[PDB]
Design a protein around this ligand. Structure first.
Ligand SMILES: Nc1nc2c(ncn2[C@@H]2O[C@H](COP(=O)(O)OP(=O)(O)O)[C@@H](O)[C@H]2O)c(=O)[nH]1
Length: 327
């Protein structure tokens, strides 16, 4: 059987809290008035929700309305509890109201306005200074939710909203977010393909906050090397092969050895044998101005197979890469 694993930080935050904090099923939703919000335009549709630009007609302030699809409606209380627990946190989206949509008859989450601009729209355009600045702002959010005993589990460019003109950032879509309980086995079908950690890809269920640090590392690698996405798998199996072509197969076998994981035998015909690549392999004339010894050292410490060997959000914020950022 697999060897158990525990978070090296904020391990017991929820164990010490009263049940009310993490027992989301016991939470009683104070339903608002759906009439207060007039939908303006559909911003997008995912497999679990529909997002709209809206106006709170009473105060004329712009808001964002997220309407849950029937498939996601069942986990409404988890997302509400997390959003309320984190409200006021640095760079975390602010929940303004919870209403029952009259058409879908599913819950609708109302958020204070943030720019329609995803980080995906800008992150391949940033200077060396701005990559550092924005990565620090993201770290602020991650360290805060981790310190509050929450894992985001869907860190990706589409889940970061940016107001570049006003140097403002918000970490959004807390729909897959979960409370960390030590020893708990979680669902590996979380995060988007390109941002999935090796723990997910090898089916190791006893993961923690460090999952978010891998996802952040993928985002950094894509920004500094101008390669969208950095690990470009055709499916979840090929995703592990793409990572192994960079990090090597020897450290992957060491990782699975350490946690006594049994790799899906389909990997025997595609994984092959690969040496760890030096990061300078990914440097070229177009991205060299974004690459520094500090950036590469920082990336090296995020993109590790062993989820326990990855920098934590706080340790990441202490990194020399962030010394040039005004604090
Ligand atoms: N509240 C909410 N739930 C979501 C959202 N996206 C996904 N979900 C739900 O999250 C579930 C997956 O989370 P998970 O922890 O794996 O739950 P499990 O299937 O019960 O193990 C999906 O089945 C959806 O119901 C979202 O945006 N909001």
């Amino acid at each position: 059987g697999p060897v158990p694993s525990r978070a090296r930080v904020y391990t017991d935050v929820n164990t010490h809290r009263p049940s009310e904090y993490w027992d989301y099923e016991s939470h009683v939703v104070e339903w608002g008035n759906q009439d207060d919000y007039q939908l303006v335009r559909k911003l997008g549709r995912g497999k679990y929700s529909e997002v709209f630009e809206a106006i709170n007609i009473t105060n004329n302030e712009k808001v964002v309305v997220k309407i849950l699809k029937p498939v996601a409606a069942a986990k409404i209380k988890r997302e509400i509890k997390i959003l309320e627990n984190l409200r006021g946190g640095p760079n975390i989206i602010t929940l303004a109201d919870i209403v029952k949509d009259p058409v879908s008859r599913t819950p609708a989450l109302v958020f204070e306005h943030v720019n329609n601009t995803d980080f995906k729209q800008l992150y391949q355009t940033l200077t060396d200074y701005d990559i550092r600045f924005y990565m620090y702002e993201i770290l602020k959010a991650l360290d805060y939710c981790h310190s509050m005993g929450i894992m985001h589990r869907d860190v990706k460019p589409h889940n970061v909203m940016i107001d570049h003109e006003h140097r403002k950032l918000r970490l959004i879509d807390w729909g897959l977010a979960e409370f960390y309980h030590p020893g708990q086995e979680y669902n590996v079908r979380v995060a988007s393909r390109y941002f999935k950690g090796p723990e997910l890809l090898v089916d190791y269920q006893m993961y923690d906050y460090s999952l978010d640090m891998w996802s952040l590392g993928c985002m950094l690698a894509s920004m500094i090397f101008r390669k969208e996405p950095f690990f470009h798998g055709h499916d979840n199996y090929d995703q592990l092969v793409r990572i192994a072509k960079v990090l090597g197969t020897e450290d992957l076998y060491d990782y699975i050895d350490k946690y006594n994981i049994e790799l899906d035998p389909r990997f025997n015909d595609i994984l092959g044998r690969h040496s760890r690549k030096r990061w300078e392999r990914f440097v070229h004339s177009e991205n060299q101005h974004l690459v520094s010894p500090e950036a590469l050292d920082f990336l090296d410490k995020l993109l590790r197979y062993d989820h326990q060997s990855r920098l934590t959000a706080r340790e990441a914020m202490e990194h020399p890469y962030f010394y040039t950022v005004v604090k």
